[PDB]
Structure 1
Amino acid sequence: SNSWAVAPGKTANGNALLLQNPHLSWTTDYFTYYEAHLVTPDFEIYGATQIGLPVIRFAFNQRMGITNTVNGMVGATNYRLTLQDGGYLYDGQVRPFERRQASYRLRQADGTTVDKPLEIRSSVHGPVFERADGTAVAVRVAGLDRPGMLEQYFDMITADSFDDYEAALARMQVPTFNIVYADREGTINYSFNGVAPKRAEGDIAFWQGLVPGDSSRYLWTETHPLDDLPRVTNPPGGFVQNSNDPPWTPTWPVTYTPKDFPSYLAPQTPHSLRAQQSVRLMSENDDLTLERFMALQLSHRAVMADRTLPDLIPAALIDPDPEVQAAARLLAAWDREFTSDSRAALLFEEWARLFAGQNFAGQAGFATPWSLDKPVSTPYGVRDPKAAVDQLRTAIANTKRKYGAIDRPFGDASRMILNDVNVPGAAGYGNLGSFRVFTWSDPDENGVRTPVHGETWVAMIEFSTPVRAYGLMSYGNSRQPGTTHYSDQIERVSRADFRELLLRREQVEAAVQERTPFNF
């Protein structure tokens, strides 16, 4: 979810910097990251990847490194089929389906399996699923003929130069993701990567819904080459970035605009307040050091309090209810940082839930709407303050219910707890503006909550000679029953005390503990 790459020119020492900061569930298994370092006579790579992957997706070495963020590349389309006479209406007539008879075994509970017949129907578009409501949906997924995904990342992260890196990138074997890049040679790059069907008509929201499946009018067959996709290289701004925002402000002096690409590639929706902070933290700072770069990554600002408390608060002070009045003074006194000691933050999240929806995205409410012309400051103000205040009222009840008081310290309700380690939390929801994210869970009956998702692997690398890199894994490097490497780094994360990442033999030779010779 967060990615930053800065060019020598914007740094103090003259060496490019990279931020690897993916945000994912702390529990779903295929999303678990693991950190490793592989060294061979011909290559070397350090980084994190999702368990089960033979190659490192977030990697770096002495020469270069890359990082990813979800871009949501629309690589499949779901067609609503018009069923009729045992086939589907398509163009002029009824076409019969391709039918394969498959079958699978089902574990019983008594240890036995039973055969389960499974009939796979396919329209010319792709396989057919019947939704619970009866809609027959055929899924057409792009890139099914791209066998080389793993090797692509592999030849990509072991590239000898940008030029060699982009050639690998160019094979279009990796179907999604924004991928950011950086060199000890100084080039930095941002690519809206993915496999995207070439289409003749349609806004991206059109392609994300049920496209009609009655016409070859909507059956694409080709996909875009890398050079048809949004990309930025060594921009005038001296940095690139992506925090899941659409690809329209990847660097600040921007280098292209939504008019320059097919409208089905990426949306043109408001950028996250976290995305907006990403651009401000980068553009507004110069002569960056690894240290300041790392300080900036910890940013935990309640950007949405900055966009609303000005109108909100005086409105609330004139409320008759003494408690609403007292809520507004607690809010007015807040430095607007989701810090552990903050007594106003919880109360504010709860107001923002109502004012901006359960996921805090949600623009109704603001007085002046979002705009690409002021991409980093526009969703702003409160439209109907009286409404907003009745929301603050409801929110006080909520906060009280959920946490037992409206002024409980943020870090006493928000906890990071792994095994028997229980440390205070800081930072929070990305959509409220916090750059460092911890999507807190709902509270248990003691008002304690933990992160459901957010910071997982976090590394920052300066491409000096030798390379210098620091990082941390929220949920340690193993969740196998009984390791001492699950709850291992959480208290470090609570203090933002990063470990130096060791790539040099001498540093490895010295930190050795646990050791295994093999021969294959």
Structure 2
Amino acid sequence: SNSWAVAPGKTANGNALLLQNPHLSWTTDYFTYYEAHLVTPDFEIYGATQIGLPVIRFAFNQRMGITNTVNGMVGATNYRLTLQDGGYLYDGQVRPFERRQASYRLRQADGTTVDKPLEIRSSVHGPVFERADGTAVAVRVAGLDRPGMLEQYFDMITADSFDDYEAALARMQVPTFNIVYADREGTINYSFNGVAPKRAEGDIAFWQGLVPGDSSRYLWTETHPLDDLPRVTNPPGGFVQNSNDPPWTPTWPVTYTPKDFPSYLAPQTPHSLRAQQSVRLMSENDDLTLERFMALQLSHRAVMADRTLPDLIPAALIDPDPEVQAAARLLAAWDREFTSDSRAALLFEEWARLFAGQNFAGQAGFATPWSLDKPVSTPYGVRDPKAAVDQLRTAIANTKRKYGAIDRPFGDASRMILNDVNVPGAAGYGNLGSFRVFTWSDPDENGVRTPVHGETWVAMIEFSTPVRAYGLMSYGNSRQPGTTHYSDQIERVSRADFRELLLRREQVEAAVQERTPFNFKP
């Protein structure tokens, strides 16, 4: 997911801009987004949210809006228990489990149910599970006493002012997520939000692994308030951003560093090349219009080719294999953009799968390692060019096997297909540098692949008066069988032809195609 908010001073017209841009699976049911507009005499909210949620997480209106990305807030601990004498060892002594006999019904092939017993054991830590390998793990989830998640979001997205927004946020009822805010009064804000246990030792990796379950040393009981968490408001650089990177370059220049916070809140890992592009696209551009803001959102640069091709190509041209030499010349002539008509992109992906791993996040191949001192220009270079040329040899073979050739057009293999709509793909993998993301599936027998994940809901809002906003939903607004509203936006997505989002009553009345009178009698 990506998220941008831009302050009035960084724009041409003087109105803040917001990008909503979550990346989730295109198939997983509970991750499916839905767009809607709710209006009463006392509030108005427009935007998207996961199905089954009664409040809009990606919301905006005439005054303000927010967006979200995953931050991985470590709100739970998995504890390894030491079992002994029917109990578990804890502070020197054996301690018996709480145990409860529950049961549930299980549907049978013949349509009947049978009653199945289920023991539920807990230690002081929490409920106990047994892994296949025999490890007894107790899971301790924070924030189980925070009933107001939905209402917090509801009050945040209907806030009359930034102060009311912050006060709602400060309730700590929403247990995770980076949350970015902007409004027509000119305020922008980034918050690394969640419910994080207060701990007296251990960095994030320690608390992400199995923590010893035999001592009160590691049994946390309190959680941090909002003002202990990384936050940025109206910074000198005039924007905030997050593209799932750790919260250490949410703006530029920065306003804090990792030392300023406990080491268990967020990782200090290298920022993805997409996250590096997020920072560059905002920082290097001034006098932004909504139109330019939108154009920048479509960025689809093979940044990793920028970091590796200078070293890889000459090394590859030294190789006696004429096919490797030809692969090198094809890559050398590529403009390093993931366009539909690129003949080199698929081959470059296959090389990168080996150089940087199947997720493209590997660092060991680089000559110059990532550094927070050069957070948008590292890592860089090819450490061992001879090895990397061998990887290219293998990649050539992989590319031919998957796609039929080393120079099949990107948009001919990469398609977006919903029902009977089949359109050319562009952009791609985030970890290669593409800001606009389409996490292409493995190809079928004919070398055709489609997005498993990536752009879903995309909206860009200028908080002018009235507001102006544009958006698309990759997979439509309906997934019910027979709907005409599943495949009806993907062609527009293939051309980045965004819909004007219609908030004013007169616009809605002009666009209406169906009217459902209702009434609610409690």
Q: TM-score range by the shorter chain?
A: over 0.9
SS at match of 2:211: strand
In structure 1, the partner of 2:219 is 219
Distance 2:187 2:101 in 1: 53
By how many angstroms is 1:120 displaced? 0.4
Deviation at 1:148, TM superposition (A): 0.1
Deviations 1:426-479 (A, max 9, x none): 000000000000000000000000000000000000000000000000000000
1:312-344 deviation digits (Å, cap 9, x = unpaired): 000000001000000000000000000000000
Secondary structure of the structure 2 residue equivalent to 1:307? helix
Q: Shift in Å at residue 512 of structure 1?
A: 0.2
CA displacement 1:472-496 (0-9 Å, x = unmatched): 0000000000010000100000000
What secondary structure does 2:423 align onto? Answer: strand
Q: Within 2, Cα distance between the matches of 1:433 and 1:426?
A: 13
Q: Is 2:16 aligned against 1:16? A: yes
Per-residue deviation, 1:497: 0.1
Q: Could you give the per-residue CA deviations for residues 279-303 of structure 1, whole angstroms, max 9, x where no partner exists?
A: 0000000000000000000000000
Secondary structure of 2:235 counterpart? coil
Q: Distance in 1 between matches of 2:86 and 2:48?
A: 49
Distance in 1 between residues matched to 2:169 and 2:258, nearest whole Å: 23
Counterpart-to-counterpart distance in 1, 2:317 and 2:279: 34
The equivalent residue for 1:340 is 340
Residues of 1 paired with 2:209 and 2:47: CA distance?
36
Q: Deviations over 1:498-517 (max 9, x none)?
A: 00000000000100002100
Question: Partners of 2:56 and 2:481 in 1: how far apart?
Answer: 24
Q: In structure 2, what is the Cα distance between the partners aligned to 1:258 and 1:385?
A: 34
SS of residue matched to 1:117: strand
User: Residue 34 of structure 1: CA displacement?
Assistant: 0.2
Deviation by residue 1:39-85 (Cα, 9 ceiling, x = unmatched): 00000000000000000000000000000000000000000000111
User: 1:310 Cα shift?
Assistant: 0.2
Q: TM-score, normalised on structure 1?
A: 1.00
Aligned twin of 1:253: 253
Other-structure match for 1:231: 231
Q: Spell out, residue by residue over 1:87-121, the C-alpha distance to the aligned partner (whole angstroms, 9 max, x if none).
A: 00001111000001110000001000000100000
Q: Deviations over 1:376-396 (max 9, x none)?
A: 001100000000000000000
Sequence identity percentage:
100
**Cα offset for 1:240?**
0.1
SS of match in other structure, 2:67: strand
Q: Distance in 1 between matches of 2:472 and 2:390?
A: 42
Deviations 1:178-199, CA, capped at 9 Å, x for gaps: 0000010000000000000000
In 1, Cα distance between equivalents of 2:109 and 2:45: 44
Matches within 5 A, 1:338-487: 338-487=338-487
Could you report, residue by residue, the CA deviation over 1:202-247 in whole angstroms, capped at 9, with x for unpaired residues?
A: 0100000000000000000000000000000000000000000000
- In the alignment, structure 2 segments of 5+ residues that lack a partner are none
How far apart are the structure 2 equivalents of 1:184 and 1:515? 31
Partners of 2:421 and 2:32 in 1: CA distance:
19
3-state SS of paired residue (2:199): coil
Distance in 2, matches of 1:253 and 1:276, equals 14
- How far 1:126 moved relative to its partner? 0.3
* Separation in structure 2 between the aligned mates of residue 514 and residue 77 of structure 1, nearest angstrom: 49
Question: CA separation in 1, counterparts of 2:446 and 2:164?
Answer: 55
Partners in 2 of 1:415 and 1:206 — Cα distance?
A: 42
In 1, Cα distance between equivalents of 2:356 and 2:253: 30
The separation in 1 between residues aligned to 2:380 and 2:91, in whole angstroms, is 48
Instruction: Give CA deviations for 1:324-383 in whole Å, capped at 9, x if unaligned.
Output: 000000000000000000000000000000000000001000000000000000110000
Q: What is the CA distance between 1:167 and its match in structure 2?
A: 0.2
Distance 1:102 1:310 in 2: 63
Cα RMSD over matched residues? 0.3
Q: Secondary structure at the match of 2:14?
A: coil
State the Cα deviation string for residues 154-191 of structure 1 (Å, max 9, x = none): 00000000000000000000000000000100000000
Distance 1:59 1:100 in 2: 42
1:144 maps to 144
Question: 1:174 aligns to what?
Answer: 174
- Residue 3 (1) aligns with residue 3 (2): yes
